[model samples]
Target: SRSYPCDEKKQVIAECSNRRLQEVPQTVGKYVTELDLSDNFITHITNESFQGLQNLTKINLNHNPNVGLNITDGAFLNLKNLRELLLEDNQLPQIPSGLPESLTELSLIQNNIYNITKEGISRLINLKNLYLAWNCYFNKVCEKTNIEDGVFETLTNLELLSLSFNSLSHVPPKLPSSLRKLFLSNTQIKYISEEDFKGLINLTLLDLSGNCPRCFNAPFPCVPCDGGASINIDRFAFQNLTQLRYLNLSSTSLRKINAAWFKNMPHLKVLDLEFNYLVGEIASGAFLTMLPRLEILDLSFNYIKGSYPQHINISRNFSKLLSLRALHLRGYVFQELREDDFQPLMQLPNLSTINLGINFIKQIDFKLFQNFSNLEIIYLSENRISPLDFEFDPHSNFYHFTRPLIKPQCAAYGKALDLSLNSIFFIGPNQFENLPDIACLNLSANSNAQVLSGTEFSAIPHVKYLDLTNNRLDFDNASALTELSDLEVLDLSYNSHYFRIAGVTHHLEFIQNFTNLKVLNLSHNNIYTLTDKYNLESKSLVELVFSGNRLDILWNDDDNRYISIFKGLKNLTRLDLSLNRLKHIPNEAFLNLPASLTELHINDNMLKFFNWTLLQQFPRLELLDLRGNKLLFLTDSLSDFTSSLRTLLLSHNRISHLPSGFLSEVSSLKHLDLSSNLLKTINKSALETKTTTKLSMLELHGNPFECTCDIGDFRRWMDEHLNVKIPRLVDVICASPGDQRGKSIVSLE
Candidate 1:
């Protein structure tokens, strides 16, 4: 019996990817129904490549990266059941000939093919999806791929066709009228006539991005249109696409938006005009009135500029889009927001999401948002907003200027507010008082105060998710968050500078008030202690991450060590202790963790020996990642191993060998990784057990396997278990026995 290092999940699916094989494995059984030979060195395909696998319904030969993967005629003619074939990134010069007519989907992306003849794919009448992108630009030289006038018209059943990145100057003529989705992005098409897309009435999606590229402030080297002119689109170009619901014309220079172009497109829901040059049209364009059902619109990174106090007439232009749900106007260079700029859109009942990020807006009257009754999220990041944006007058019944309040009408469905990437110095008390229904608040990457009053979110007691990462927060004000009893996720990571000055003991005092908190991330905060008088009580904490902290304080012999800080966390399931400079985990430290922990991450530590006796504490622990440690050997303190451990990652360690019955003891183990270790050979004593039958995945690459007689049994075991998925098995070569060095152990004689 010979195993091919393949995964036979049900004796039908076979995956032989990334195996460093030179050709298709002839050893694959005929019972296999799906074969994946992607990411290999196979350079040629012939009739005999899949001779007996006639039951195969799908085959993937993507990412073979050969100079030119040649395919002989009638290579797949015998597979009558084959329905899908993928040959992407294979560098073929042209379409493979004599393909089986049974194929329904074929991908030839990233190939060197420059032409598509009528007879090449005319026989594939059953084909529904065809992809041929990245074909004309092979070998760093670009040439427009010529498509015969009626090449695709033969596929009467074709529904999706992608010809992006092909450098075609025009749409392929006489396309199949059955196509529902057509992609011709990144082409050289500069002009579109009314007859260009005439008969394709079923098209629901048409992407023509990057045809007339934008050059202003572009990250990549861009080529503008002829004399920087916009693509000439005839008024009735899309008249035939009555069923089109999504149209992506992004990155195409357009100086004007014509309402007549979309006169017949009543079902269009999404219109993406991002990365364009539409300036004055945004304020006066009446094209949106034609799209009565447009739900989502993306006009980000345009050349529109609106000065302070003088807002654009957006409400007049967007008032007719009653079905609009989300509107994105990022990077519009608007200086200030007027009170009535979106007054007309306030009548839109379904408007939920509005993204105005990267607009450089300095101030906003929050009260202006009170007219929107169904707003859920409003992203205002990357702006010049500061704490002064909320400074209101003191002696007023209703503070309208500085302290703008959004009443219940607008806060009825307000779920999230993102003000990240700004210069907000601090959020004073009651700044978010009226947003009672807001559940998520994101203030990341902002210059908040070092010592907050803790009352910043006191008014928004219903906030369940709060992110304060990359801020200047300190634990000295931890008591300020006592009012947020309903908070579930609180991310306070990346405040290393301020956390270094605050005492770590004060961090746990307010956690007891968060009865609904499930995840708390205080990583990279320079926290130095877990043995504090507070006992770290939180019954609702399901996952706690204190990684990248100075937690070597576990070695301290203080009275607090007997307190068991994690005893109150009865529902804790995961804990992260990685990047902590601890030499070893003392027995008392392990005793402090909750028994409900199912996953623990202690990688990237300086631990030398882990106590095996501590395994008896958590019977439900399933995943233990001990990678990047200094362990020399496995320590079994007892004869019985009774845990639900399923996956164990011991990679990047110094372990040389595993003791007998060490793996068999963990009867529930299914996946194990021992890569990048100091192993010379793995014998039968370490693997020959009942556990091998249940194991599904294993990783032994990067180990120095001795290909001499010492590894004879392990070599034979590899050929007997075809069910185990050992990724990159061919890379496990020998490092000893001078003559056998660098040879793969699987090929050893």
Candidate 2:
């Protein structure tokens, strides 16, 4: 019952995570304060395992593998109020010298520490952030890692340093102007030199991903890499990192990123030239004349071609990005995108959100977002633009998603259009009067959404959330839902309608164009009875999934029974009649339901004797799933219910006894599942009455329970009644002493 950061809102926190121990676990709770032995299989770490916890201040031994633990020398000298320490994926080939010189952040990521000696890091001079990533692998080091020259002269608060992947071929010539976040990603760094980041000017976050390195431009100072390598950037390569912001030269094999490679970054915001192999001239005004407070530019999975018009033609110097605002060009991976191929964003007037997805742009002229006024969001998903060059009002088209509270004069204009998983299908009818603001429209998996109609979406009105789920849609294309008007949420779940006219029976046409319906999913439509189309002039209907449509009896369609389908669902709140082969209903099905009905899913339907007054007047009936209904006797006349019931699932139903006033009126009953029923003996005279004072969770696990030794009556009335909560209490067992039958009920007293 305890795991991670658990304080149950106040005390007993230091959760000694998953104990499968080999060491470090001397019982707990003596001034505990956050201690997690991560994925344990612990190996070593002496000093009597944190002897008197002196109120530990955070200690999470990360992954714990690679020949577990070996820390000895005063293993963190009595947690001296330890201040953060997580020995990352351990193997510890070095640096474990009695830390906690009042430690301050240390995580030896994937440790096997090959080298860092100034005599193993100058003695934590109050070490400030250090995560030796994937520790040296191939360039074979140690024996004084290339003869430690300075090795961070006495850790003087080493800001943040992550020797990423590490096999380091260069760059570690001394670094420590209080370094500010440096991670040399996948390092074997072929070579780069502006004297390898001279004296890092309060550097901000730099990661040279997948190394190529080689910059050096001064009469060539430190030049040496004619091995066809590239990644050179020196106009004084990031000249003195004027507080560099966040730079990750991603997937480096760089093609071109000139503009003196963001000369000294003017507070650069975020630039990660993703998966580079660039060509096709996209100078995009080379970092807008040098990092003008760059906002976020990740030329994703690069290929880079033309399209930055203000004229490269579309008007004047197209590639002019003035203070960029979020551009991620994805998947060009071997050239693709044309048709004026994205007239290249209208001179970034504050570009909003852009990710030209999986490109191979088949066709699109899109007047090219006429001077996009902060173009909202555009991700032409996994494109190869089928559906014959999909187009939507090449310009402004009023949008509407909800906003027609009784027709805000029939409100319109809402376009969240992503022509989903494209491939020509058809949508005949005003071909969508060219998106009059189509709101949230994803023709979900339209493998040619296979024939659909009712005015082919009758010019999208208040289209709210429509995912035409798995379109194999048959049966007169489901009479196009009586002309789906202003829908609120409609996912015609895996459709397959029927009627074969053997005596007409159909039920879900309940339309008034679903007058702002709340939710209606005709689950797997093999439907059993619904023909009455109940649209008692709707009132925002709420969730009604006719579960997996093997829907059998709702009283075999006597004109759509179940008391006229629970009297036109007066604002129904969630009624999933599970796997509907339902065995009983008629008889005032909840009298006149919809007192805002709360939740009554008749689990795996084929019910046995459920007459709990067919849910006698649900006073906000709270979840009552008659699970896998083979229910045999759970007769609770439900003594006049005014119940605000709470979960009563009669598990695997072969129930054997209950009616001792059967919960007399479950007055706000709190979770009671008579588990795999055939129950042996239960007390409190078969459940309480003073409205069972909020009965707390009671599940009689696979029942046959009847422990002995006279049971001390209800074997210790839940420690003198602190509101009942009995779940496999000591893993319930002991059925009737044939010498303690199958043991367990905590060893039957």
Candidate 3:
């Protein structure tokens, strides 16, 4: 008998080949647990393959190119502990009948089986998981009857079934009652019945998406719901399964869902009816009698039209669903959120999240949320909100209005809020007094937002995260942001203002009070200069973004005497000053920077080159962005200073090519973006030296490439490597040849 060393037996593996031994070998079956005889020209498998192996659990016989297995019907009858079986990527025209009962997992992916009969799959009673994906037999059936009844009834312990990428019409045969998850996506079924899921009382999740089912048997006399056509919903359609927690009927061409659709599902939590052609108005109290435990309801991307002209009284409807948490009304037909639209929800003390994004609500009065005392999150993004003014009157009744003057107790329980991408330009005093507990506020993408004085935000003391990017602010009043002392994250980028310390006044000195600030973004501003005259300091500042600015002069004084302006920022870790007009950087420009500063950005300037000694002074420097400059060449001094550099951006420059041994010293380089430059080719020998380092993201877009016979090696290297992402892969062309200036160099190869 073939024996394995007792101490190293755990690592031993077994293999079989075309030298097929018909008799059972006691030595081969004693210790082997995994077997693979993929493509050795073998024709069949005998009991000898699994001879005395009681621990055999996984077997693979792939790419054999044989007619069929020569083993008997019960060849694996003694292997009672087998768990996994793989017969995929094969040429079997039909299922090999009589599978092992001990098998719990089977994969028939990418097979040639034509049909699956009841008797073929009824014997595997212990099968808990099955994968029949990408099989040619899926195309044999055109309707729902292709799957025979009781085909999977023996798999009573099954928990998960995957029938995706198949050609199915109606719901498949009845599944086991113990099944917890069912995936019926990418099917051709046009309709579903209550009987299809009659026995699955314990099913918790069902996915019936990606189908185009018809809505009604015939056109209705009139559109009962609203602006869209109407469809008939049968009564008691879903009165069975009571334990369902998740249901997805998206893209099912449904026009209406009557109250009977969820009559028996009192424990349902999530219901998604998106991407349907629902047009009818829901009858009053339609959902009040069912789905009482619903938490998340998604009705977005539908064609439901027209507003409920009569105010909907939902006081009782919302009170019944005490467990409701989040409600999404993104694309509904309602044009306004009248005072009574949310009156029912206000009575729900447990509601926490409300999503009104992408709705037709235009105005926001104070009383809109007057009753939701326990709310924690409110999403009002992408709506048409007017400026915040006490005297402002909405011209159209279609706009939403929430009078902040509701019961005083309900307004005291403030929550996190989002009012971005609206038309709000002004906020009167005490406008936010009713929402004192708000912690997160996003007012970005509102170009009309003006700089607010200290008095505007005096009442909000709990705010921690504030986003006011892409707005219009007065750069001279830097004190406007001093009111938020508890702010931990702030984004003020892309604002229409010129950043100049000399132009600001002493009233903005209060900016130094934000001791809790951690993130500060001031990029994309018209900052042409940086001076120390205005004394604004924040010791807690960790990140400072100043890119996309016009900083031409590194220092303003004649002798660069004022270069110590950035001295007091002892906690600064990041600094971005790219896309500037600096022709020279003084030696003292790097001084006074905090010892914690690890990253610096100074790209897109007019610097011809700099010595390693200039950057070696900053011992903590690890990252640098130096692209789009005027560097003509690089020397050995450049490579000596990159010992600590981890990331570098060197694209869009005038360098004809990189210097030899340039990357020899930087053994720690991990990421590099080198695109839109003047390099024509690269040698394989130069890349081999840097192979010890791990390169994650590499950019080679916008490089002039010569398609000569010698350069074929470069093309081959790029084709063999799969990590490179060339943004201009299809737009790259040679500039020297007049006929190829605007055409791609790699065309129709």
Query: What TM-score would every model get versus the actual structure?
Result: 0.89, 0.35, 0.63
Measured by TM-score, how close is model 2 to the native structure?
0.35
**Backbone N/Cα/C clashes per model:** 2, 22, 16
Top candidate on lDDT is 1
Query: lDDT per residue, candidate 3, 187-268, as tens digits?
Result: 5455567677777877777767545532332121111223322222346545677788998776566655667778678778
How should the candidates be ordered by lDDT, best one leading?
1, 2, 3
TM-score, candidate 3, is 0.63
Over the stretch 1-749, how does candidate 2's per-residue lDDT look in tens digits?
32212222235355445444557766556667768777666778888887877788778887664235788876876777776788876768887876766677878776577766765556667778877776554333432234277777577678887877666777777677888888876565766787788778898988886675323221111222365366665557678888988988866667766777666577888877666655343443454567556777776665434432221111122345566676776655323333354455566667755666655555544435434545544455555555431122211111111221122211233445455555435665545554434555665455543445466666665566666655544433335645656677776776543422324444344433466778777677565443445322356778777687643444554544344554566788787878867776555554655667788687987777666655556667788787888888755556565466777887888887777656445667778787777777666665445544566777776777777644555555556554566654423566676877765564455
In order, the Cα lDDT scores of the candidates are 0.77, 0.61, 0.60
Best by TM-score: 1
Model 1: which ten-residue window has the lowest total lDDT?
A: 391-400
Better of 2 and 3 by lDDT: 2
Measure candidate 3: CA RMSD. 12.6
Off by over 4 Å in 2: 1-77, 80-234, 238-338, 343-478, 481-532, 535-749
Candidate 1 Cα outliers beyond 4 Å, as residue runs = 137-139, 305-312, 389-414, 501-508, 529-535, 553-570, 637-644, 683-698, 712-728, 731-733, 738-749
Q: Candidate 2: lDDT of 639?
A: 52
